[PDB]
């Protein structure tokens, strides 16, 4: 028999399975489409949600009935100290998807970046990138670095820099940095690698990535809530008071 | 040193849709594409030579073989019937068999 009355289904099937992530940081699934007729630039950053407040803003849109004295709106503050570029990676378009070809790293790597490679820092030998730094200027290692640059300029289509935050600039108790790959969108692969090479060990501020009054996309992990019933997870209707064995379940 | 055999593939046992008779094995000799080229191989020797990884303390040979004869053709496509001293193991389906040039009639 048909359901007597029609109603929209509770919850979205676009978000099933409904499973909690493991890492706190959320990797962006995609980057803006590349355009080859513009100067190279970075297409992303990384910040920490400080909190919310509210503002009053003057309305500049015309033909609107909003008050001329301003409208109260909520805002979210995202603290974004400058990030440090530690290296870059080239990607190649294969018949199975993007494949990283090689990764080139800077000479000096901060201890915040190194902590990402262990699970117990205080019990570690803390020798991450030690061989890479020790023989950085060796003639054999210099030629390998140049070949890596040349290989990317020939057999790569996507260039991303490896940038990490400086956790000493935020009140977070964490000391291990958060690492993100920021894709370079711009000219050819030759001038994209040149842009990334000049960015090694430099600091990139959030103003160099985002402009003024720019609409952007934000990717993050929602606040955890633990085990929950069907009333909160989906929003189904509660059962009558007369119900045996409980009210907050799908009948 | 030299090649004095022809690779024949152990296609399977003489069978029907749902039954199977392991007394006769069906071989597909290399280079024989029709039943009219089969009369040469009727009566020839066929060996299924297989390797067994024996232990050092064992006197069993590392290389063993099962010998048989080609007795009749099977269809119009050069497949033959062979009978062996012991029925071939069905784990050897698709493996290669040696078809020798003896008993010679030339």
């Amino acid at each position: 028999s048909h359901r007597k009355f029609e109603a929209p289904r509770h919850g979205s099937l676009a978000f099933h399975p409904r499973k909690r992530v493991h890492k706190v940081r959320a990797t962006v699934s995609a980057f803006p489409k590349d355009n080859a007729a513009e100067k190279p630039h970075l297409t992303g950053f990384l910040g920490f949600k400080a909190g919310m407040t509210h503002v009053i803003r003057e309305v500049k849109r015309t033909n609107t009935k909003l008050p001329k004295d301003g409208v109260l709106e909520p805002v979210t503050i995202i603290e974004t100290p400058p990030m440090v570029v530690a290296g870059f990676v080239g990607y190649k378009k294969t018949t199975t998807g993007l494949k990283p070809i090689t990764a080139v790293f800077a000479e000096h790597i901060a201890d915040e970046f190194k902590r990402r490679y262990t699970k117990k820092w205080y019990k570690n030998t803390k020798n991450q990138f030690a061989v890479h730094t020790e023989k950085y200027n060796d003639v054999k290692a210099k030629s390998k670095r140049e070949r890596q640059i040349r290989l990317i300029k020939n057999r790569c289509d996507v260039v991303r820099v490896i940038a990490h935050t400086q956790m000493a600039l935020v009140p977070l108790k964490q000391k291990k940095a958060e690492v993100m790959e920021i894709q370079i969108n711009g000219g050819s692969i030759a001038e994209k690698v040149d842009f990334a090479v000049s960015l090694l060990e430099k600091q990139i501020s959030v103003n160099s990535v985002f402009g003024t009054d720019e609409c952007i996309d934000v990717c993050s992990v929602t606040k955890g809530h633990g085990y929950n019933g069907v009333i909160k997870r989906f929003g189904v209707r509660h059962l009558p008071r007369k119900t045996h064995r409980g009210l907050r379940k799908v009948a | 040193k030299c090649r004095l055999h022809v690779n024949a593939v152990f296609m399977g046992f003489q069978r029907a849709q749902r039954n199977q008779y392991p007394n006769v094995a069906l071989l597909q000799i290399s280079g024989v594409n029709t039943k009219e080229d089969t009369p040469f191989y009727i009566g020839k020797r066929v060996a299924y030579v297989y390797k067994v990884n024996v232990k050092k303390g064992s006197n069993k040979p590392a290389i063993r073989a099962i010998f048989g004869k080609i007795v009749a053709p099977h269809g119009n496509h050069g497949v033959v019937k062979a009978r062996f001293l012991h029925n071939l193991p069905p784990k050897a389906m698709g493996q290669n068999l040696k078809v020798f040039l003896y008993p010679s009639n030339i």
Partner: protein, 173 residues
């Protein structure tokens, strides 16, 4: 298909024992030809096997099976609607071959099995008496056509390999 010349006569009070019935029956073998012959006598002259006796049943061979002739076949076939008389034309060197063509043609074009067709007659027509729209184009003295998209011909089943080397090609032939 084969030809047979069959003669017989009836010896009973209804048929005089001087009337001889002849036919030229097409059949795969002489047993089938006799059966076709006896159905005609029963269905036309009330002559039955028990009351009659066969005289001759001998094969008929083409005098010159090397000259191409235009055969005109008159036949009747039973369909769902009823019974129709049809005239078909075939080109061949033997009478039996043309009749074999007719049976295969009727079974495909009209979906009519063998046991629904009766071959009334088969004669030889002239060059310009061919009316088949397709067959008429090969009757002239200057028929010429290039056979294209040829598949290469294998000499025998010996050289018929399942997987070959290199690329495959057709032939302008």
């Amino acid at each position: 298909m084969k030809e047979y010349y069959i003669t017989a006569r009836c010896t009973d009070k209804a048929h005089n024992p001087n009337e001889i019935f002849r036919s030229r029956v097409f059949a795969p073998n002489y047993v089938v030809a006799k059966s076709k012959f006896w159905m005609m006598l029963k269905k036309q002259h009330k002559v039955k096997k028990i009351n009659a006796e066969l005289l001759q049943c001998q094969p008929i061979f083409e005098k010159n099976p090397t000259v191409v002739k235009n055969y005109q076949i008159f036949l009747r076939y039973v369909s769902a609607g009823g019974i129709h008389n049809i005239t078909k034309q075939y080109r061949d060197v033997t009478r039996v071959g043309a009749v074999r063509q007719m049976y295969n043609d009727l079974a495909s074009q009209y979906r009519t099995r063998q046991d629904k067709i009766q071959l009334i007659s088969i004669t030889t027509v002239g060059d310009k008496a061919v009316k088949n729209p397709v067959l008429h184009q090969f009757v002239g003295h200057h028929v010429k056509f290039p056979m294209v998209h040829c598949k290469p011909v294998i000499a025998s089943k010996r050289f018929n390999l399942p997987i070959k080397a290199g690329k495959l090609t057709t032939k302008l032939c």
